[PDB]
Amino acid sequence: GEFEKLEVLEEWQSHIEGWEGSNITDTCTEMLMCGVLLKISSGNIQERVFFLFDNLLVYCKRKHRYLFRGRINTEVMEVENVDDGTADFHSSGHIVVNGWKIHNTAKNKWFVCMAKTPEEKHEWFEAILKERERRKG
Ligand SMILES: [Cl-]
Ligand SMILES: [Cl-]
Ligand SMILES: [Cl-]
Ligand SMILES: [Cl-]
Secondary structure (H helix, E strand, O other), X not given: OHHHHHHHHHHHHHOEEOOOOOXXXXXXXXXXEEEEEEEEEOOEEEEEEXXXXXXXXXXXXXXXXXXXXXXXXXHHEEEXXXXXXXXXXXXXXXXXXXXXXXXXXXXXXXXXXEXXXXXXXXXXHHHHHHHHHHHHO
């Protein structure tokens, strides 16, 4: 139950190097989705591991297994679909497939994510929506 879930969240966080902000259990109670995605930010394309919790998105770089890269309160997170074959114009550019944009409205920063398959993209969309609906009731 809820106590076990907190314990598991803190175990998870303990293995992240360079954690920023409050501890995961201050805002979160369970992990809703995780997965490896390609992230394009200012034209640099890299693999990241993304974790969606209630109230929070966290992304990290693999290799302390994970290195902290960012967090977004889901209240300030917006999403925009990108249709397959659309160009991302940052640095020398990239063709986006199974992708979407994440907008951090607190920082006014945008980046592209890409999943491996349309099913995996669909799963992320559903997870993000479900998280948003929980908070809305
Ligand atoms: Cl429990
Ligand atoms: Cl990053
Ligand atoms: Cl929201
Ligand atoms: Cl949105």
